[PDB]
Amino acid sequence: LWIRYGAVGFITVVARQISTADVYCKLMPYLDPYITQPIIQIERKLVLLSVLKEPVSRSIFDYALRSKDITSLF
């Protein structure tokens, strides 16, 4: 959750720094794989936090990061 919300912090700050045109043309394409709905108001911290896809299960994430053969697994 610290990293998860940390990411929201980065994406929200980035979304506030770039132009609205660049947000839709450039910022949205990087976020699309992780967001549940296409909302143009990504600049509001509450909006982005609400549109995030569910995180990876800790058992799944921890089990993959703990795997010795992460290259073969990936």
């Binding site: 132009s19 609205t20 045109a21 043309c25």
Partner: protein, 44 residues
């Protein structure tokens, strides 16, 4: 030095025959077209 100030120089290896000044003009023209698209996108 005279060629550098006027920008009337090209790559020594011949990879590109377009002068530095010519490339600078093309870059400015492309930047203008990009902003025009950006404005139409903003309107849309």
């Amino acid at each position: 030095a005279k060629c550098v100030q006027s920008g009337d120089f090209v790559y020594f290896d011949g990879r590109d025959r377009e002068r530095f000044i010519d490339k600078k003009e093309r870059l400015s023209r492309l930047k203008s077209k990009q902003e025009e698209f950006q404005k139409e996108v903003l309107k849309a």
